[PDB]
Amino acid sequence: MKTLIARHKAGEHIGICSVCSAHPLVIEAALAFDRNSTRKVLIEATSNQVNQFGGYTGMTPADFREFVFAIADKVGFARERIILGGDHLGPNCWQQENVDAAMEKSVELVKAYVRAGFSKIHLDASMSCAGDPIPLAPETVAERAAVLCFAAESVATDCQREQLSYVIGTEVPVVHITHVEDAANTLRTHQKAFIARGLTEALTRVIAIVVQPGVEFDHSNIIHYQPQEAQALAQWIENTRMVYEAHSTDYQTRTAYWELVRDHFAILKVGPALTFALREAIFALAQIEQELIAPENRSGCLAVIEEVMLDEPQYWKKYYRTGFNDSLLDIRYSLSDRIRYYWPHSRIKNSVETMMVNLQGVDIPLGMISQYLPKQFERIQSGELSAIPHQLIMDKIYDVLRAYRYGCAE
Amino acid sequence: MKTLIARHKAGEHIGICSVCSAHPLVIEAALAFDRNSTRKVLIEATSNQVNQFGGYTGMTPADFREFVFAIADKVGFARERIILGGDHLGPNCWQQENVDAAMEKSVELVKAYVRAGFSKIHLDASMSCAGDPIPLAPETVAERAAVLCFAAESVATDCQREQLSYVIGTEVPVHITHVEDAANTLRTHQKAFIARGLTEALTRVIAIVVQPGVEFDHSNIIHYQPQEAQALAQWIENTRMVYEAHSTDYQTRTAYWELVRDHFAILKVGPALTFALREAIFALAQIEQELIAPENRSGCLAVIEEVMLDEPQYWKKYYRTGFNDSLLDIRYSLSDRIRYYWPHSRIKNSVETMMVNLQGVDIPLGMISQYLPKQFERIQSGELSAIPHQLIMDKIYDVLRAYRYGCA
């Protein structure tokens, strides 16, 4: 959103949390969390999650829109308060193909997103395809981005075009804090590639550049933002119309989010942390169900989750450790959150629902909430929350959204 | 303390947290929590815990003093910053016995506390003994308090006497205390104390126990309703005393603050401290199940459950009858009857086996977020480590933090 960024550029401490999750409960929580505020909610898909072929979620951009809208309707959240975004749009998942074929799919990808009413468009053709040199000449990155912007602008209706915002650049190094001269060079070459295609107006719609401010996580480690080390970057962006977008901002302290927004990292992408919180809720509720529910009725859902992930290891296998118990500890507790790819699995969905139905039929003792969901227990104590399983899950996800809101709001 | 209450009577928002626990770890947490402040720490025992005959702890009041002091020495807590008190001192343990046998036990109980340097003394002889009318006449309750106070006075040094504070009354009903019944309790105690020659000792009565509308049981908390305790709050302003409130466990930090404001200046906590300790133990046992090799696991939880099922005297009258229900009560009830089992030999050793296993291992961040999320947030902000002992300490500090919010 242009107005929010303009308020930031005029010196207001304000940022936006970009929700990068396809999980329906996470999207429900994101929308519910702001139901009674006036803030816009930003939800973004990656070209892998959703594209013209359905990505891996079986959703086209049009599908994803209606999916989010249907959740919004159920919540009571006005569809117009929703910003939809495309993350890392470009040849990303057609990387193994030659330039022509990957760039043909990328053009139709950008067009699919734009036609579906996605207004925030991240253009990223920094990856080398088959036959390409490694790495790309920075001029080649820019040119390919201009081709993608040209495609967006050409399918846009007049109304959509004026509302389109472009993000450029990538967090991927060609943790290493981005050099100001590389960010400068990324802008300069995008400028030049845009002008070479007559994209003079579209260039004023490039609102953000992606940099690495010094944040990351892997399995059991967080790289905490160090403001002193990002001051050069922070200062460079001030003499532009743009803000920074930061990726992989998950698991930072609420102080860091505030510092980040102060230092002009005003669009903060979150994802794993949201489903990580959801998963902690499900695990907590499953432990509760194991003791509270009669043995013939228990869902067995933790055993189901584990079995599925062990037999279809493809989404986790390249991330986790080899030792057997180490792999289970990772499957369960890694900040990386590779479990997020398995919630759609039919066995997992069925057993989690069985669990939910079971727990909705009985009052959960307060002491079990204190044990397994302590922060929810305290909110129940203060009369702000009920012991309803669905609300306990929401609240778990809200706590992630609360950390961001502290950073992004006044 | 008399100066704390004097500040309160002069209009300052100040309270004190009365820690009613015998657990060494909770006592250690209490002392370490105020290690760097200038606050006094109040630790109280009941007759059941500690008396002439050792109670159930196997500690006389003298033993309990050295036990607190030994913990204070390790923390680096100056012994002089500690206040030792006796809770519900009177014939509660020996109700089954005759009036005069239960009362002789009670005077020797109260003498032993005073001799051992306990400076805060709750006199409560409101229970009916064998041969008594149910309930006792308020005059009778008053009379027996005067007897116990006389016994406390009869043994103090000049120094100890100058320092001796009394509390009177009880929370146990004969629903929020009628101002009238509170006034009647005070009035009768004054008359009985005076009649016993105890006019000077009367000036040393610092508090009366009432019910301000705070309670818990297994899975329910009755939350303090400030507007319902306003009549009580305005009555005590006229008197030389403050209120002491019992069973304040599990309230909000804002209810604690409201309590002190409304002159419930002594707040008694106990089961919430050990409840928190038990949550840390249970979380660590789960972490141990997943991190430690099969041949080295403590079997902590299975030992606890077995021991509690086999020696069930401390919980049997509290918990439910159904077998699974009784397991859920044993684990999770806010009554925390498990607190009586920590000193058992099998439980102690399996808990220490667990701690030894866990101290050699690196606990993944993700597990602490799952099982100890508030501790994880502290680690996340770099104000705590993934050290098992420090994880138990922090669970107990959170209870203590809520009180400090209300009291300081």
Short mmCIF file of C-alpha atoms in Angstrom, two decimals, chain B residues 10-404:
data_model
loop_
_atom_site.label_atom_id
_atom_site.label_comp_id
_atom_site.label_asym_id
_atom_site.label_seq_id
_atom_site.Cartn_x
_atom_site.Cartn_y
_atom_site.Cartn_z
CA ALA B 10 -0.13 6.22 56.16
CA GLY B 11 -1.42 5.85 52.56
CA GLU B 12 1.44 4.22 50.62
CA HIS B 13 0.64 1.51 48.06
CA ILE B 14 2.66 -1.28 49.63
CA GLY B 15 1.89 -4.92 50.38
CA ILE B 16 3.84 -8.04 51.32
CA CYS B 17 3.78 -11.49 49.72
CA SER B 18 3.53 -14.27 52.32
CA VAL B 19 5.21 -17.38 50.91
CA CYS B 20 3.49 -20.39 52.52
CA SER B 21 5.65 -23.18 51.16
CA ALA B 22 8.06 -25.74 52.59
CA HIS B 23 9.61 -26.77 49.23
CA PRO B 24 13.37 -25.97 49.26
CA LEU B 25 13.28 -24.82 45.58
CA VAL B 26 10.40 -22.45 46.13
CA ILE B 27 12.10 -21.05 49.22
CA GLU B 28 15.27 -20.62 47.20
CA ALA B 29 13.34 -18.90 44.41
CA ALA B 30 11.72 -16.52 46.94
CA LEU B 31 15.08 -15.58 48.38
CA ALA B 32 16.90 -15.24 45.03
CA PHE B 33 14.04 -13.18 43.60
CA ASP B 34 14.66 -10.45 46.21
CA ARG B 35 18.44 -10.97 46.49
CA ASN B 36 19.29 -7.55 45.05
CA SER B 37 16.34 -5.53 46.31
CA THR B 38 15.96 -4.18 49.87
CA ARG B 39 12.62 -5.95 50.36
CA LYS B 40 12.01 -8.24 53.30
CA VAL B 41 10.90 -11.80 52.49
CA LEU B 42 8.07 -13.45 54.47
CA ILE B 43 8.05 -17.24 54.72
CA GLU B 44 5.37 -19.00 56.72
CA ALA B 45 4.72 -22.52 57.94
CA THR B 46 1.43 -24.07 59.12
CA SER B 47 1.22 -26.35 62.20
CA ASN B 48 0.55 -29.25 59.83
CA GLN B 49 3.90 -28.60 58.10
CA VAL B 50 5.90 -27.70 61.23
CA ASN B 51 5.09 -28.12 64.97
CA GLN B 52 6.45 -29.58 68.29
CA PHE B 53 6.28 -33.06 66.76
CA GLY B 54 7.77 -32.13 63.36
CA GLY B 55 4.42 -31.96 61.52
CA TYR B 56 4.69 -33.86 58.24
CA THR B 57 7.98 -32.20 57.16
CA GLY B 58 9.83 -33.74 60.14
CA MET B 59 10.76 -30.18 61.14
CA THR B 60 10.15 -28.36 64.39
CA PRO B 61 9.97 -24.56 64.08
CA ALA B 62 13.68 -24.40 65.10
CA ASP B 63 14.57 -26.87 62.27
CA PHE B 64 12.52 -24.88 59.78
CA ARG B 65 14.50 -21.71 60.68
CA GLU B 66 17.88 -23.37 60.00
CA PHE B 67 16.45 -24.93 56.81
CA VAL B 68 15.43 -21.46 55.56
CA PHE B 69 18.78 -19.99 56.76
CA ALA B 70 20.82 -22.72 54.97
CA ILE B 71 19.06 -21.89 51.71
CA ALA B 72 19.55 -18.14 52.40
CA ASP B 73 23.32 -18.72 52.91
CA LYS B 74 23.62 -20.33 49.42
CA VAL B 75 21.67 -17.59 47.68
CA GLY B 76 23.65 -14.85 49.40
CA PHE B 77 20.49 -13.66 51.14
CA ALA B 78 21.17 -11.82 54.41
CA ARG B 79 19.38 -13.76 57.15
CA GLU B 80 18.15 -10.55 58.77
CA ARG B 81 16.03 -9.72 55.68
CA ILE B 82 13.90 -12.81 56.36
CA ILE B 83 10.63 -12.81 58.29
CA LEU B 84 9.51 -16.18 59.62
CA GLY B 85 5.82 -16.56 60.49
CA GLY B 86 3.35 -19.18 61.69
CA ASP B 87 0.09 -19.67 59.80
CA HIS B 88 -3.22 -20.79 61.42
CA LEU B 89 -1.53 -21.51 64.75
CA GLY B 90 -4.11 -23.18 66.99
CA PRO B 91 -5.77 -26.62 67.50
CA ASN B 92 -6.36 -27.41 63.77
CA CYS B 93 -4.14 -30.58 63.75
CA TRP B 94 -5.64 -31.93 66.98
CA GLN B 95 -9.37 -31.17 66.52
CA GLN B 96 -10.15 -34.87 67.10
CA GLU B 97 -8.86 -34.54 70.68
CA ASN B 98 -10.60 -33.00 73.70
CA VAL B 99 -10.79 -29.19 74.14
CA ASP B 100 -8.10 -29.10 76.86
CA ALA B 101 -5.68 -31.61 75.23
CA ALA B 102 -5.93 -29.79 71.86
CA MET B 103 -5.29 -26.46 73.63
CA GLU B 104 -2.19 -27.63 75.53
CA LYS B 105 -0.69 -28.75 72.21
CA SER B 106 -1.58 -25.34 70.81
CA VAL B 107 0.19 -23.30 73.54
CA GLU B 108 3.37 -25.44 73.23
CA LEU B 109 3.07 -25.09 69.45
CA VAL B 110 2.92 -21.28 69.76
CA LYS B 111 5.71 -21.14 72.36
CA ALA B 112 8.01 -23.21 70.12
CA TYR B 113 7.39 -20.82 67.19
CA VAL B 114 8.17 -17.76 69.32
CA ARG B 115 11.31 -19.33 70.87
CA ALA B 116 12.57 -20.19 67.40
CA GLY B 117 12.40 -16.54 66.32
CA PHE B 118 9.13 -16.58 64.37
CA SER B 119 7.99 -12.97 64.64
CA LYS B 120 4.59 -13.13 62.85
CA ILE B 121 1.91 -15.17 64.56
CA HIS B 122 -1.54 -16.07 63.20
CA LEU B 123 -3.74 -16.99 66.15
CA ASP B 124 -6.74 -19.04 65.00
CA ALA B 125 -8.59 -21.36 67.38
CA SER B 126 -11.92 -21.18 65.53
CA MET B 127 -12.19 -24.96 64.85
CA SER B 128 -14.47 -26.87 67.21
CA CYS B 129 -12.69 -29.69 69.05
CA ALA B 130 -14.15 -32.96 70.42
CA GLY B 131 -16.97 -31.97 72.82
CA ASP B 132 -17.38 -28.48 71.29
CA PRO B 133 -20.53 -26.83 69.90
CA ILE B 134 -20.48 -26.49 66.10
CA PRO B 135 -19.83 -23.77 65.53
CA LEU B 136 -17.98 -22.17 68.46
CA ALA B 137 -19.35 -18.96 69.97
CA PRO B 138 -17.29 -15.95 68.69
CA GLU B 139 -16.48 -15.25 72.37
CA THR B 140 -15.02 -18.76 72.66
CA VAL B 141 -12.92 -18.21 69.50
CA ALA B 142 -11.82 -14.88 71.06
CA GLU B 143 -10.97 -16.52 74.45
CA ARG B 144 -8.78 -19.24 72.95
CA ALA B 145 -6.91 -16.66 70.84
CA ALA B 146 -6.18 -14.76 74.07
CA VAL B 147 -4.85 -17.99 75.72
CA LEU B 148 -2.51 -18.62 72.74
CA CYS B 149 -1.33 -14.97 72.73
CA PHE B 150 -0.65 -15.15 76.48
CA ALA B 151 1.47 -18.26 75.81
CA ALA B 152 3.38 -16.42 73.02
CA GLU B 153 4.01 -13.42 75.35
CA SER B 154 5.04 -15.62 78.29
CA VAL B 155 8.22 -16.80 76.49
CA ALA B 156 9.49 -13.89 74.33
CA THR B 157 12.64 -11.89 75.20
CA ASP B 158 12.27 -8.07 75.50
CA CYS B 159 13.70 -7.94 71.93
CA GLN B 160 11.39 -10.64 70.53
CA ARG B 161 8.33 -9.07 72.20
CA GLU B 162 9.02 -5.69 70.58
CA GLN B 163 9.11 -7.55 67.23
CA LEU B 164 6.15 -9.90 67.71
CA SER B 165 3.17 -9.24 65.38
CA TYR B 166 -0.22 -11.02 65.69
CA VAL B 167 -2.81 -11.85 63.08
CA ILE B 168 -6.36 -12.83 64.05
CA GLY B 169 -9.51 -14.16 62.40
CA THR B 170 -10.13 -16.68 59.65
CA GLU B 171 -11.22 -16.98 56.01
CA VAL B 172 -13.14 -20.23 56.67
CA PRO B 173 -16.93 -19.48 56.75
CA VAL B 174 -19.01 -20.19 59.87
CA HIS B 175 -18.93 -15.54 50.08
CA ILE B 176 -17.48 -12.16 51.06
CA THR B 177 -17.15 -11.32 54.78
CA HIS B 178 -19.84 -9.01 56.20
CA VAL B 179 -18.25 -5.86 57.67
CA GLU B 180 -20.37 -6.61 60.74
CA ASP B 181 -18.82 -10.05 61.35
CA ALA B 182 -15.35 -8.58 60.86
CA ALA B 183 -16.15 -5.87 63.42
CA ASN B 184 -17.55 -8.50 65.79
CA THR B 185 -14.33 -10.58 65.42
CA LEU B 186 -12.15 -7.59 66.32
CA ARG B 187 -14.47 -6.44 69.13
CA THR B 188 -14.60 -9.89 70.85
CA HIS B 189 -10.79 -10.40 70.50
CA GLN B 190 -10.19 -6.98 72.08
CA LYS B 191 -12.48 -7.82 75.02
CA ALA B 192 -10.96 -11.29 75.53
CA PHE B 193 -7.34 -9.97 75.21
CA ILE B 194 -8.05 -7.12 77.67
CA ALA B 195 -9.76 -9.56 80.13
CA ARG B 196 -6.59 -11.74 80.01
CA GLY B 197 -4.38 -8.76 80.93
CA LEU B 198 -3.16 -8.49 77.31
CA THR B 199 -3.81 -4.77 76.56
CA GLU B 200 -0.22 -4.21 75.40
CA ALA B 201 -0.12 -7.35 73.20
CA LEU B 202 -3.35 -6.12 71.60
CA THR B 203 -1.44 -3.11 70.13
CA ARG B 204 0.67 -5.72 68.31
CA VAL B 205 -2.29 -7.22 66.37
CA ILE B 206 -1.48 -6.06 62.83
CA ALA B 207 -4.12 -7.82 60.74
CA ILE B 208 -7.42 -9.67 60.60
CA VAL B 209 -8.22 -12.44 58.12
CA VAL B 210 -11.36 -11.98 56.01
CA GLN B 211 -12.74 -13.39 52.72
CA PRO B 212 -12.48 -10.61 50.05
CA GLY B 213 -13.87 -12.90 47.29
CA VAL B 214 -10.75 -14.88 46.22
CA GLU B 215 -10.67 -18.68 45.96
CA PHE B 216 -9.68 -21.61 43.74
CA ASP B 217 -10.38 -25.26 43.47
CA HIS B 218 -9.45 -28.08 41.02
CA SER B 219 -10.39 -26.34 37.75
CA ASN B 220 -11.95 -23.04 38.83
CA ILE B 221 -10.78 -19.65 40.10
CA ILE B 222 -13.01 -17.16 41.84
CA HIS B 223 -11.62 -13.86 40.70
CA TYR B 224 -11.41 -10.87 43.02
CA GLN B 225 -14.28 -8.43 42.38
CA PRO B 226 -12.99 -5.05 43.72
CA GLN B 227 -16.42 -3.34 43.92
CA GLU B 228 -17.71 -6.21 46.09
CA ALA B 229 -14.92 -5.73 48.65
CA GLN B 230 -15.35 -1.93 48.98
CA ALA B 231 -17.31 -2.05 52.25
CA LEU B 232 -14.51 -4.18 53.78
CA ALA B 233 -11.84 -1.77 52.39
CA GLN B 234 -13.47 1.29 53.97
CA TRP B 235 -14.03 -0.38 57.38
CA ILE B 236 -10.38 -1.36 57.89
CA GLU B 237 -9.23 2.22 57.18
CA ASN B 238 -10.74 3.20 60.59
CA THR B 239 -8.76 0.51 62.44
CA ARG B 240 -5.08 0.13 63.33
CA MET B 241 -4.84 -3.01 61.21
CA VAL B 242 -4.71 -4.16 57.60
CA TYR B 243 -6.29 -7.32 56.08
CA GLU B 244 -4.46 -10.56 55.58
CA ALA B 245 -5.91 -12.61 52.73
CA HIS B 246 -5.44 -16.35 52.33
CA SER B 247 -5.63 -18.60 49.20
CA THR B 248 -4.72 -15.66 46.88
CA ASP B 249 -3.14 -18.09 44.40
CA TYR B 250 -3.94 -17.82 40.68
CA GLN B 251 -5.32 -14.27 40.57
CA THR B 252 -4.31 -11.70 37.96
CA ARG B 253 -1.52 -9.21 38.66
CA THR B 254 -4.11 -6.45 38.43
CA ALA B 255 -6.26 -8.21 41.10
CA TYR B 256 -3.18 -8.34 43.37
CA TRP B 257 -2.67 -4.61 42.82
CA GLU B 258 -6.39 -4.01 43.57
CA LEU B 259 -6.12 -6.14 46.72
CA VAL B 260 -3.27 -4.12 48.25
CA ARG B 261 -5.09 -0.85 47.31
CA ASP B 262 -8.17 -2.19 49.17
CA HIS B 263 -5.95 -2.96 52.24
CA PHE B 264 -5.43 -6.65 51.72
CA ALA B 265 -1.78 -5.83 52.41
CA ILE B 266 -0.61 -9.34 53.34
CA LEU B 267 -1.18 -11.79 50.46
CA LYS B 268 -0.74 -15.48 51.16
CA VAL B 269 0.48 -17.73 48.34
CA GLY B 270 1.44 -21.39 48.42
CA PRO B 271 0.07 -24.04 45.99
CA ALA B 272 0.64 -21.71 42.95
CA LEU B 273 4.39 -21.76 43.75
CA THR B 274 4.62 -25.55 43.85
CA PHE B 275 2.07 -25.87 40.99
CA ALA B 276 4.52 -23.84 38.87
CA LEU B 277 7.41 -26.02 40.05
CA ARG B 278 5.52 -29.15 39.08
CA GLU B 279 4.82 -27.77 35.56
CA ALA B 280 8.60 -27.25 35.12
CA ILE B 281 9.25 -30.80 36.38
CA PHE B 282 6.61 -32.26 34.04
CA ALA B 283 7.94 -30.26 31.04
CA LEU B 284 11.48 -31.41 31.77
CA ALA B 285 10.34 -35.03 32.13
CA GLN B 286 8.73 -34.80 28.68
CA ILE B 287 11.93 -33.21 27.27
CA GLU B 288 13.93 -36.00 28.92
CA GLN B 289 11.66 -38.68 27.26
CA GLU B 290 12.69 -37.27 23.87
CA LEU B 291 16.33 -36.21 24.33
CA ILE B 292 17.83 -38.92 26.51
CA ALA B 293 18.76 -42.49 25.41
CA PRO B 294 16.15 -45.19 26.40
CA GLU B 295 18.64 -46.99 28.70
CA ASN B 296 19.29 -43.79 30.69
CA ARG B 297 15.78 -42.29 31.15
CA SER B 298 14.66 -41.59 34.73
CA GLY B 299 11.06 -42.81 34.38
CA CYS B 300 10.23 -39.72 36.47
CA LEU B 301 6.52 -39.40 35.73
CA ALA B 302 5.89 -43.17 35.96
CA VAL B 303 7.61 -43.20 39.39
CA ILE B 304 5.50 -40.21 40.62
CA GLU B 305 2.20 -41.76 39.45
CA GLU B 306 2.98 -45.15 40.95
CA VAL B 307 4.04 -43.67 44.30
CA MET B 308 0.97 -41.40 44.43
CA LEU B 309 -1.40 -44.26 43.55
CA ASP B 310 0.24 -46.54 46.20
CA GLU B 311 0.50 -44.01 49.05
CA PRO B 312 -2.58 -41.89 48.29
CA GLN B 313 -3.33 -40.40 51.75
CA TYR B 314 -2.42 -36.75 50.92
CA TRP B 315 -4.80 -36.57 47.92
CA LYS B 316 -7.56 -39.18 48.41
CA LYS B 317 -10.03 -36.81 50.14
CA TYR B 318 -9.45 -34.10 47.49
CA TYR B 319 -9.65 -35.75 44.07
CA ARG B 320 -12.21 -37.59 41.95
CA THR B 321 -13.14 -41.29 42.11
CA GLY B 322 -12.91 -42.39 38.45
CA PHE B 323 -9.46 -43.73 37.66
CA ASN B 324 -8.61 -41.46 34.69
CA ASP B 325 -10.26 -38.50 36.49
CA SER B 326 -8.03 -39.16 39.48
CA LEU B 327 -4.95 -39.16 37.21
CA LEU B 328 -6.03 -35.77 35.76
CA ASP B 329 -6.51 -34.38 39.30
CA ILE B 330 -3.20 -35.84 40.45
CA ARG B 331 -1.46 -34.09 37.52
CA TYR B 332 -3.33 -30.88 36.97
CA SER B 333 -5.56 -29.85 39.88
CA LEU B 334 -4.98 -26.33 41.14
CA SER B 335 -4.99 -27.82 44.68
CA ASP B 336 -1.53 -29.20 43.93
CA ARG B 337 -1.76 -32.17 46.33
CA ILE B 338 1.33 -33.53 44.50
CA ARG B 339 3.29 -30.96 46.56
CA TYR B 340 3.23 -33.42 49.46
CA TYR B 341 5.10 -36.07 47.41
CA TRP B 342 8.26 -34.20 46.38
CA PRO B 343 10.11 -35.45 49.52
CA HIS B 344 9.39 -39.14 48.72
CA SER B 345 12.62 -41.16 48.24
CA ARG B 346 11.71 -42.73 44.84
CA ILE B 347 10.45 -39.41 43.49
CA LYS B 348 13.39 -37.42 44.78
CA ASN B 349 15.93 -39.82 43.23
CA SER B 350 14.15 -40.10 39.86
CA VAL B 351 13.82 -36.31 39.71
CA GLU B 352 17.56 -35.97 40.42
CA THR B 353 18.41 -38.67 37.83
CA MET B 354 16.38 -36.57 35.35
CA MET B 355 18.20 -33.35 36.27
CA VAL B 356 21.61 -35.05 35.91
CA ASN B 357 20.61 -36.42 32.45
CA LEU B 358 19.33 -33.06 31.33
CA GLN B 359 22.32 -31.09 32.58
CA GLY B 360 24.64 -32.86 30.13
CA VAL B 361 22.38 -32.25 27.16
CA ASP B 362 21.59 -29.31 24.94
CA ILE B 363 17.86 -28.58 25.01
CA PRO B 364 16.69 -27.44 21.57
CA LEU B 365 15.04 -24.03 21.55
CA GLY B 366 11.98 -25.49 19.81
CA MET B 367 11.29 -27.81 22.75
CA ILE B 368 11.34 -24.98 25.27
CA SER B 369 9.00 -23.00 23.07
CA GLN B 370 6.68 -26.03 22.98
CA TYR B 371 6.74 -26.96 26.66
CA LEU B 372 7.97 -23.80 28.46
CA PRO B 373 6.92 -20.92 26.16
CA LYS B 374 7.28 -18.07 28.71
CA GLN B 375 10.84 -19.29 29.47
CA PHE B 376 11.54 -19.44 25.76
CA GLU B 377 10.51 -15.80 25.37
CA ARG B 378 12.99 -14.89 28.12
CA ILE B 379 15.79 -16.82 26.43
CA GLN B 380 14.70 -15.20 23.10
CA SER B 381 15.27 -11.77 24.68
CA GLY B 382 18.52 -12.99 26.33
CA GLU B 383 17.42 -12.65 29.97
CA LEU B 384 17.50 -16.39 30.83
CA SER B 385 19.33 -19.56 29.68
CA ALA B 386 18.28 -23.10 28.75
CA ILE B 387 19.60 -24.38 32.10
CA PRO B 388 17.16 -26.83 33.72
CA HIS B 389 17.57 -25.36 37.25
CA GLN B 390 17.05 -21.82 35.87
CA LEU B 391 13.93 -23.03 33.95
CA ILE B 392 12.35 -24.26 37.26
CA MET B 393 13.38 -21.02 38.96
CA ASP B 394 11.77 -18.87 36.26
CA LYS B 395 8.43 -20.75 36.44
CA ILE B 396 8.34 -19.96 40.18
CA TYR B 397 9.53 -16.32 39.67
CA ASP B 398 6.47 -15.70 37.40
CA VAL B 399 4.12 -16.36 40.33
CA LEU B 400 6.30 -14.07 42.44
CA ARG B 401 6.36 -11.40 39.70
CA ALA B 402 2.54 -11.13 39.81
CA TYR B 403 2.65 -10.51 43.55
CA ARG B 404 5.50 -7.96 43.25
#
